[PDB]
């Protein structure tokens, strides 16, 4: 520690906080693959319909 008034020379202050960036998980999926749902907790059931020729 300096024994003189070193705080006098602190003539500039920069504070690094960053920023809330986009999640990197978006890079692992195509835009069409992601679809939001309205839920907070529990279970949701999705039905896939299918067709075939007899």
């Amino acid at each position: 520690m300096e024994l003189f008034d070193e705080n006098y020379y602190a003539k500039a202050v920069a504070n690094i906080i960053g920023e809330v960036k986009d999640p990197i998980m978006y890079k692992w999926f195509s835009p069409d693959q992601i679809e939001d749902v309205d839920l907070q907790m529990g279970y949701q059931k999705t039905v896939k319909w299918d067709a075939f020729l007899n």
Binding site: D22, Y26, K27, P31, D36
Partner: peptide, 28 residues
């Protein structure tokens, strides 16, 4: 926003818009 529920809905919509913008500006 009138209330906290509307504030939360606005936050979710903002997140969705950010995701859409990221995918539109992404170039692989």
């Amino acid at each position: 926003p009138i209330n906290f529920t509307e504030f939360v809905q606005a936050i979710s919509n903002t997140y969705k818009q950010r995701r859409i913008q990221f995918y539109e500006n992404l170039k692989r």
